[PDB]
């Protein structure tokens, strides 16, 4: 029986791309926001929103993804009034564009935009005004981080992004990444800045490891990125 | 709200689609673990040490047919911790429980509510707060567990949920043991109103659950015997 109506938070999971989608909502004003929605599960998302009696104000992407197609464009039609949002530095199409310091207001809540490039130049982190939660996209993963060998990625930039924008948050602040490949669903700032095998290294040691992963080009990057630059629109049927 | 909030971590096992839940008291450093899987026990143990917790109980909601419990192996990796399962499951464990029993860890408590149906040994763990309920395969998100194996009974399942789960506060969270559609959490309010199966008449519910004509899970002939003996295979 806490005095204030707790924020509504629902974490969904797309098993193939291992992508996390996040639904945030004000329980009282029934306004909501959707972070990193996937195209294939867009109608599922929309169904839950209607079932919860919520109204979707924004469909937001932490960055231009290369592993799946965004559902933000589809949601504009499935939920009239909804607006697509993405960083200006992503260079990707959307109804609205944000940059560092921008605030996405929904109900009595707000997601504060902190630019955290590295994985891509357009990566941003969404911190709840409470500073109790942070949605880090692929900038910071649980016990890891996004690769920096593609999409004009820079390891040195990533290292500084996380240390200056995410690790500077309260230790108790939750970490909700855009992906997880090991069965986790959440972490904390305190955990990562203490235990993250990569980000606890020096910047030097970090850059040298990120360049030696020698991972392969993702399967969908050729079809995923362009579609996301156009807010999800791809050749039909 | 002066005492620290409960620690809660939801892990996911992709092939089995199983949810393992780590619950802990931040101030007491005492923890429990609900439905741990064998293939991810080392991972779970490592996380417990990283968080600086001491695992008291490795707990199972019921005797699983889809995977092998990590409760056995965790008794080795984290000495002092004990396996816990319902007496009615007929399964081997260090401790056995029944409706009404509390599993204490720090200032927190899991109220055991006997919720048979999917199996005779199914129980739902309700946080003393009444803000969370770990429902096993009794109540799934927008569904429920199959009732055609492990001596399951549909009429019992319907009653269990309606009497033990739907009686909880509407805003109480629902954390199932599985999900096959990308969800992680639900609420009592939602399932009470939206669960396509359990919102039906009991009589209707008993009918359709038998009509599914699904194939028995592949892992059952190996999971259940191993889980009846705390993870020991063959
Ligand atoms: Fe990415
Ligand atoms: Fe089961």
Numbering used by the authors:
A (entry chain B): 17 to 253
B (entry chain A): 18 to 251
Text taken from the publication that reported this structure:
EE is caused by mutations to the gene (HGNC: 23287) encoding for the ethylmalonic encephalopathy protein 1 (ETHE1, also known as sulphur dioxygenase, SDO) and correlates with increased cellular levels of hydrogen sulfide. ETHE1 is a non-heme iron-dependent oxygenase that catalyses the biochemically interesting oxidation of glutathione persulfide (GSSH) to give glutathione and persulfite [Eq. (1)]. ETHE1 is reported to be localized to mitochondria where its activity is linked to electron transfer chain energy generation and is of central importance in hydrogen sulfide metabolism. Sequence analyses predict that hETHE1 is a member of the widely distributed metallo-β-lactamase (MBL)-fold family.
The final model (orthorhombic space group P212121) has two chains representing the dimer in the asymmetric unit. The hETHE1 structure reveals an αββα MBL-type fold with two central mixed β-sheets, each containing six strands, surrounded on both sides by helices. Non-denaturing mass spectrometric and multi-angle laser light scattering (MALS) analyses indicate that hETHE1 is predominantly dimeric with some monomer also being observed (dimer to monomer ratio ∼10:1); quantitative gel filtration analysis indicated a mass for hETHE1 intermediate between monomeric (26 116 Da) and dimeric (52 232 Da) forms in solution. The active site of each hETHE1 protomer in the asymmetric unit contains a single iron ion. Interestingly, three of five characteristic MBL family metal-binding motif residues, His79, His135 and Asp154 (corresponding to His118, His196, and Cys221, BBL numbering system), act as iron coordinating residues in hETHE1. Residues His81ETHE1 (His118BBL), Asp83ETHE1 (Asp120BBL) and His195ETHE1 (His263BBL) are present in the hETHE1 active site, but are not involved in metal coordination as observed in the current structural data. Analysis of the enzyme surface reveals a channel, comprised of residues 163–166 and 226–232, leading to the active site that is sufficient to accommodate a substrate molecule of GSSH; this channel is apparently conserved in the A. thaliana ETHE1.
